[PDB]
Amino acid sequence: WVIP
Amino acid sequence: WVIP
Amino acid sequence: DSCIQFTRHASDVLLNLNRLRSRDILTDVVIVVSREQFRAHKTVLMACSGLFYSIFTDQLKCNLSVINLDPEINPEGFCILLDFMYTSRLNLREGNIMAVMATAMYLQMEHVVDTCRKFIKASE
Amino acid sequence: DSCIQFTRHASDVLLNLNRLRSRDILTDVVIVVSREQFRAHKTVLMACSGLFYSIFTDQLKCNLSVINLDPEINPEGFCILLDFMYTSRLNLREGNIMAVMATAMYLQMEHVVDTCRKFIKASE
Numbered sequence A, B: 001w002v003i004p
Numbered sequence C, D: 001d002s003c004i005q006f007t008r009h010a011s012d013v014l015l016n017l018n019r020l021r022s023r024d025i026l027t028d029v030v031i032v033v034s035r036e037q038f039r040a041h042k043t044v045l046m047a048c049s050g051l052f053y054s055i056f057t058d059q060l061k062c063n064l065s066v067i068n069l070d071p072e073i074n075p076e077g078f079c080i081l082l083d084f085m086y087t088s089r090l091n092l093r094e095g096n097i098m099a100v101m102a103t104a105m106y107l108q109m110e111h112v113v114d115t116c117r118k119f120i121k122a123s124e
């Protein structure tokens, strides 16, 4: 999971 | 396009 | 093999599937969550959820145009997860994390369940 | 928004759509290319091809279970492109590049047409  |  | 790969292909396909969903094109099922209805593509639901995979591979249920979810399922939690299925983006907030995790466990969406458990463990 | 994103989601969805194709699950159309038949999902074809997008948004053609391609279309070229649609991998070879490019132009698959033109320009 990432900060888009 | 890339070499997978 | 000696194949080449187009990096953005999977993302572009999903973006187009979401455009079809937004315009209600070729949607083939309604998911009923209490008083709310959500139109979707059976294939996308199966590709994202262990529960929908089991439902639509069933020889009788594969032909249903309406699927009613358990009454304990929160419509907002379902909406957030349906958006995730079609975009890879999860709108996870302190106010919705419990409903989202409960819905992801029911839908059998392992990666969503995992991030919810991690975000909850951080706030305790 | 304040969304988080699951990097591998789009790829995992496409992998699952390809698994459904391999087991012939919920395929809803046959594409006829001369003597050959290819089963597929209308939504995936539309998401990958400008031609299939136009065909299945047509109020009459959207309901057809069989689509016949132009007789000039090569079945192997179509097969290679259908595999690409479901996997992001293109099996481009000196022996098939001309058929693949001609099929990608007909199907309106701009990125495939672009790499074919580049690979052809390099060999001249």
Ligand SMILES: O=C1Cc2cc(Nc3nc(Cl)ncc3Br)ccc2N1
Residues within 6 Å of the ligand: C046, C047, C048, C049, C050, C051, C053, C108, C109, C110, C111, D016, D017, D019, D020
């Ligand atoms: O957390 C998750 C997400 C998910 C998706 C599917 N979907 C499919 N799985 C397989 Cl093996 N083949 C085709 C399809 Br469609 C099955 C289980 C799960 N569990």
Ligand SMILES: O=C1Cc2cc(Nc3nc(Cl)ncc3Br)ccc2N1
Residues within 6 Å of the ligand: C016, C017, C019, C020, D046, D047, D048, D049, D050, D051, D053, D108, D109, D110, D111
């Ligand atoms: O080279 C390409 C690939 C492609 C795909 C689509 N598909 C869609 N396009 C739009 Cl805008 N909305 C929903 C869908 Br499905 C249209 C044109 C093209 N040209």
Ligand SMILES: [Cl-]
Residues within 6 Å of the ligand: C048, C109, C110, C111, C112, C113
């Ligand atoms: Cl997931």
Ligand SMILES: [Cl-]
Residues within 6 Å of the ligand: D048, D109, D110, D111, D112, D113
């Ligand atoms: Cl393309």
